[PDB]
Amino acid sequence: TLLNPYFGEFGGMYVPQILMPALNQLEEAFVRAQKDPEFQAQFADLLKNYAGRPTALTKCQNITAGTRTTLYLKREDLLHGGAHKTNQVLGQALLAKRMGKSEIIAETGAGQHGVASALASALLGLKCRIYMGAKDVERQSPNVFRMRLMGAEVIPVHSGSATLKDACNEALRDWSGSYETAHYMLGTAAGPHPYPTIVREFQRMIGEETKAQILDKEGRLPDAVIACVGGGSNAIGMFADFINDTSVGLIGVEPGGHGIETGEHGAPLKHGRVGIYFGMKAPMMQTADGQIEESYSISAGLDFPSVGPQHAYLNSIGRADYVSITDDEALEAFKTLCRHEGIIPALESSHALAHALKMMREQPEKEQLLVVNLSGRGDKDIFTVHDIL
Amino acid sequence: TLLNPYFGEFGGMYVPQILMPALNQLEEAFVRAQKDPEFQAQFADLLKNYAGRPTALTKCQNITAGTRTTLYLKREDLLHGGAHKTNQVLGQALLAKRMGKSEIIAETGAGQHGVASALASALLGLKCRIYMGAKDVERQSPNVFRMRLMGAEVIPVHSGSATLKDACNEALRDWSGSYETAHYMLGTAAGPHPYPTIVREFQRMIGEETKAQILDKEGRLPDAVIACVGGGSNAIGMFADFINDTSVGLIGVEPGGHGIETGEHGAPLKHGRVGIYFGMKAPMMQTADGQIEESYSISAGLDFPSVGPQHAYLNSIGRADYVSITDDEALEAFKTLCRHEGIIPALESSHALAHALKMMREQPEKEQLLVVNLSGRGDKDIFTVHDIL
Amino acid sequence: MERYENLFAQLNDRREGAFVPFVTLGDPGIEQSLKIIDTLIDAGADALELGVPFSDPLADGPTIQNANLRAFAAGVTPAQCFEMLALIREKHPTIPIGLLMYANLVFNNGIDAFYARCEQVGVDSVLVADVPVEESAPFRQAALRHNIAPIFICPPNADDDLLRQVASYGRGYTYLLALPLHHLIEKLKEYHAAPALQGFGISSPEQVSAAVRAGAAGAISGSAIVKIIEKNLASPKQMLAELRSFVSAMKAASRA
Amino acid sequence: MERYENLFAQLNDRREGAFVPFVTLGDPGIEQSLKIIDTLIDAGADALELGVPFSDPLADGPTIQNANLRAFAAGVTPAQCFEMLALIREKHPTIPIGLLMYANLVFNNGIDAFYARCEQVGVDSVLVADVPVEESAPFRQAALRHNIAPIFICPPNADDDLLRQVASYGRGYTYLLALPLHHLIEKLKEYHAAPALQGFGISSPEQVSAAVRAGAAGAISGSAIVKIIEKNLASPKQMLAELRSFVSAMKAASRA
């Protein structure tokens, strides 16, 4: 490979032999795209004029009242599509095109990755089929209607458990046959190399923008940048430019679900064991007998049962620290941001906010500059939040 | 008054005598706020860092295929809240504050103005009560839940018809008593002076930004800027900076509803007669006996039964031309923008798009630079559009 | 224009204030309303303030809103309104009749034409609830040309300039609604406003006596009459009896 | 490691290709599967390729997916898998037994420990479906140290470098799945790969004969055996009879 597939011991390319030329075609394309100024220019242009970048860094005025914490929110909820998904989905479609591909294959749980592939496909003239589990289709039919409205074919997986792990599989099976004409648009900074590396580079503008904006506003770097971790793209998008700034802490928040102790959680990096699945060697949600199981969380967008290799590596060397937040701590932080700053956050990003609130509340005289990554808006979650209250 | 209340013959201040000092307090405050650099700076700062301005001007690449039309979309759907409402709601709350007020009163139909008042109130620490008709509450309960989540009190009007005209009334009755402590945050560029003028100046940054961006991208001004007209703020926000540029056409699109000929439409400026109601002398939806009646449209956000005075004036002198678009022409333009550029427009803004498509389709070899004002996103409309198809 | 002057002349000889009931025209039925207006006059109403039904009231809310609805359902068209107004005048030649309107219904078929039909049916004044004195010139000039007195509301928040304009422009009576009443009434007298009638919350005989004593030439009782009408809607003969005793009480109290 | 060499020696004297059925272990029941495997061997299977149930198959989809499910429900734990594997070896001392696995189940309790339990129960080879030759060194070295032949898939899209690696690293047999078959088989022979068995779509006796003739040392029939099992799931004695005649047909055809 031209690039290292491993992040320490985490990573790899644990796929069937037949998919290995597809992954090496993809890595060659990417390395080449990276050196090409006009690739970059084309990607920048769509992010500005279509997607809405730079997004804003909002200083929270009211939520930090009576503590010594300054809190800034990186406004990925203001991105076209209403989630950071869009950044990388535009860069992978530009790449499918640069490789002469004409189709896109993708997988989903709660349809946000599906909707973002459908929208980048419709914009760039690629045909797009989305694999989504029948359990997920039944539950996420607003997002299904929306994917279909953008011209994408939605194929209901029924493989046993009919959830995202089954979707990911069937999507890889299809790409085994189609890889000459189709590109697989993988949803997070997980799976086989080069997807961990590709998805990160196509999300790193979140971190590069935060560094430039915080220095403009505050004249110094934050003390911590906080971001939730389903599979890890928004989190690694925020952390990447800060990794060499040893001064800046990087905290990743996994769904603690109903509580770690209950087992009903979605926190494999800190409470699952390493395994080899989804094409990578990484920590995951599994039984004592190596059968993989489902992540649980209040937010359906944090239900990937494993995490990106670069996160598991960053944890090992002690460079980033990973924490969990309960469903209930996330609901309270949802409610708090609504009521005090008039921003309805996504329940996924509420996990990261809830941690920054905890840090604040527990040590109210601690002077600290935090940046939370507000990764999506919560309009989809208002129905969920409405049965809960 | 310090400012002219009339736009030709349209306008005025046709309120009870008791509200007249409230309107003259408000006009004095506004004129003063306009001369104050730090008012301006505070307003600019929130629009940038909170709301998300400048919004983008997206060139449509695919929808104009095989015609000689270039089409740009002004991306107000990328504004915080998902609609241009937000611009003026932030400027009127900054103004309520500058006048020492501590409450906000507002009215709604489909809750988008309600949600935008709730969010500006929660951000700036004002108490907020929203009057919304019981028919509207029953129909718009996602928006109601969302207003309540931001700490606003939602009061269900039941006055006879229990729709926006009844809401507007009850809101004025309340401000008759509260005007010393409360500010009425009027929803469109309609009602008594100075609201026509105030709402316009707090929406004119849409037009000022479009002029600067189109000259950057195309090196020349558009041939037409198209925008739908419920009561008129987005439309007058887009047109204002272009009014002296005689070269640029300005087309406003009213809801033709089921068809003008059927009577079930929402197009008073071109198919209603002048009357005096809502505090102004302007064209409106009324019976032969002067009783006001409801506007009809597929989009609930275009159901104001009258229009801003400055539009009716601009029509009279032939400076702007106003057209209508059917419910069905709006549904097709909704579907078309989804399927070809992966932007789900608001059904309100689909009326303006549908007109720009008609201009294009009818004269495909006509070379023309158009700018449509995409005033909101259509996530709220996906449920509506889903029973229709 | 005139009947007011005559009524105020007659009352001033009698050392008595004017009592004016308010009622909406056509509520709860046309025949019914015509019987109510006859019993109000019979029971001692000095003048009449008649509301027409409109899209919705602003200057008046709850009770009046409910009352307009009852009249809308009753089929009271503008045609029926002037037909009713002509018969009320045919039975009662002297009573001052004033109308409470909204600006759209005046403007609808021409301002000047509204005032001509008023003059033709024998209306004496028109109060247009939503035209501030700042917007009144067309309505004023048209009323004057048809000998209709333009009534203006003088609100609690009145300031001197407003007070001078209401005295320069109104005729018939001033509708009285910071500043002690006693101070408002004095400044109106000074400026030579038409006789002030107190309209706010006159619901007890005690209140009519208070108003007269304060120097207001009399009291308009708004919603209270409508309240008896609502309270007794299916009991009509005793709705009428309650009305009669109430107006007799109110009226007795103005003899002060 | 050995039984393969012995089987390929015996077959080459007989001018005959190897026929290898694939079946998932525990499907549709443990007893049932053990009876199926005995009838397959009895009917003429030359070697056995046994699938273990995993979270889900990738390298194999529909039919196999359904088959794993049936075995999951049957309570086939890894403990039951090796218990079953030990008895199959106790009844049939000579049959080569190969396992089709996924990398997680190998890695779960230690790679080297998986291969030790394999050696203890008498398994001859392991094919780990998702470990490309680029990731195989730990699995390879561990298999070799426990005398388990590491089986690798040689895919249609094979290129020369891949061909040289599969010949340098595999043992037992090569699993054969641009390039004419005839050209793929020649290059493997040249590079001295282990005997190629054709695994793609062998479902008719015609197809086994074609493979042998092409120079492939024999044919693996994947899903076809599973299909008879599904087709007859509640008819068990005739499920077994269908299996027997099918394997006899398949096997007869390899005598070419």
Ligand SMILES: *Cc1c(COP(=O)(O)O)cnc(C)c1O
């Ligand atoms: C996609 C999504 C996430 C979860 O995924 P990551 O890959 O971990 O970044 C979090 N928040 C929002 C709002 C999302 O759309």
Ligand SMILES: *Cc1c(COP(=O)(O)O)cnc(C)c1O
């Ligand atoms: C508020 C709204 C409108 C209609 O109102 P105007 O006052 O005419 O501008 C149009 N589109 C969207 C998306 C809106 O939110």
Ligand SMILES: [K+]
């Ligand atoms: K996860």
Ligand SMILES: [K+]
């Ligand atoms: K309208």
